[PDB]
Amino acid sequence: TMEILRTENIVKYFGEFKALDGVSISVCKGDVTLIIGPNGSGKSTLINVITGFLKADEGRVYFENKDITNKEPAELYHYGIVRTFQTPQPLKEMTVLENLLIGEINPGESPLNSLFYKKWIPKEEEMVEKAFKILEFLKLSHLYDRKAGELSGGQMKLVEIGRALMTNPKMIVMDEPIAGVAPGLAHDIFNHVLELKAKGITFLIIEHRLDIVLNYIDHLYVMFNGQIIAEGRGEEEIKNVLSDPKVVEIYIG
Ligand SMILES: Nc1ncnc2c1ncn2[C@@H]1O[C@H](COP(=O)(O)OP(=O)(O)O)[C@@H](O)[C@H]1O
Ligand code: MMC
Ligand SMILES: [Mg+2]
């Protein structure tokens, strides 16, 4: 059942505003950990911290029982950490394949800082084969040469998860992939989520609320104002924890 990632009271500040007041989690192996909370509670901050993007003012982060606190995102790549980045504008001007090919130009690193080491896209024998394999898996076989701009929101998010796949991570980090989408697509993003969970990959997803994908969740952790206000790790634990009075109040609006 072992744990794979645990923080030790993560704190953060943005001027005078303490965006995180010692956040301690329990991400683990093969689990589909989802952190939800209204906007402002610091959900995308705990992430930039866990990924190294934003520094921990005071606290720790352990992966495989190791201190990775404050390590560079480019450092974490070799530990097993990777994050799903929204595809940039100059990036949406290149095909789906290449958009995953760059996922290796710089692994565990920003699509910006990855493609910025690209003089001419790496059409090496192994990278092509690996990509196209991943393009079939994600059911995005038929779009290998479609510009990424021509991709719907749905077709897009999976090419972004593929880009993050082009490293072969032990854990992937997603910040609101279904947040906003139609219910048909919610299951779609999450479909592959279980298609990769059964391949040995651990997820750290983050959504505003948890409505549609409750039957997937392996572990829930709610957040309000930089802290953890409730937690479930089972269907009834989570249902109760969502339909928990104070927990359904912060979502009245
Ligand atoms: N660069 C920043 N400078 C100052 N405040 C920030 C910055 N980034 C985020 N915040 C603030 O931190 C709070 C919540 O953090 P945020 O990452 O936005 O969490 P969430 O994902 O729940 O919206 C908000 O008040 C937000 O505007
Ligand atoms: C121990 Hg999850
Ligand atoms: Mg956020």
UniProtKB/Swiss-Prot annotation:
Residue ranges of domain ABC transporter in the record: 5-250
Gene3D superfamilies: P-loop containing nucleotide triphosphate hydrolases
GO molecular function: ATP binding; ATP hydrolysis activity
SMART domains recorded: AAA (SM00382)
A single Gene Ontology CC term: plasma membrane
Any single biological process term in GO: amino acid transport
Alphabetized UniProt keyword annotations: Amino-acid transport, ATP-binding, Nucleotide-binding, Transport
Pfam families referenced in this protein's UniProt entry, alphabetically: ABC_tran
Binding residues for ATP: 37-44
Record PANTHER family: BRANCHED-CHAIN AMINO ACID TRANSPORT ATP-BINDING PROTEIN LIVG-RELATED (PTHR45772:SF5), CONSERVED COMPONENT OF ABC TRANSPORTER FOR NATURAL AMINO ACIDS-RELATED (PTHR45772)
Subunit structure: Monomer.
Reported function: Probable component of a branched-chain amino-acid transport system.
Family indicated by similarity: Belongs to the ABC transporter superfamily.
Protein name according to UniProt: Probable branched-chain amino acid transport ATP-binding protein LivG
Originating organism: Methanocaldococcus jannaschii (strain ATCC 43067 / DSM 2661 / JAL-1 / JCM 10045 / NBRC 100440)
The organism's taxonomic lineage, starting at the top: Archaea, Methanobacteriati, Methanobacteriota, Methanomada group, Methanococci
Gene behind this protein: livG
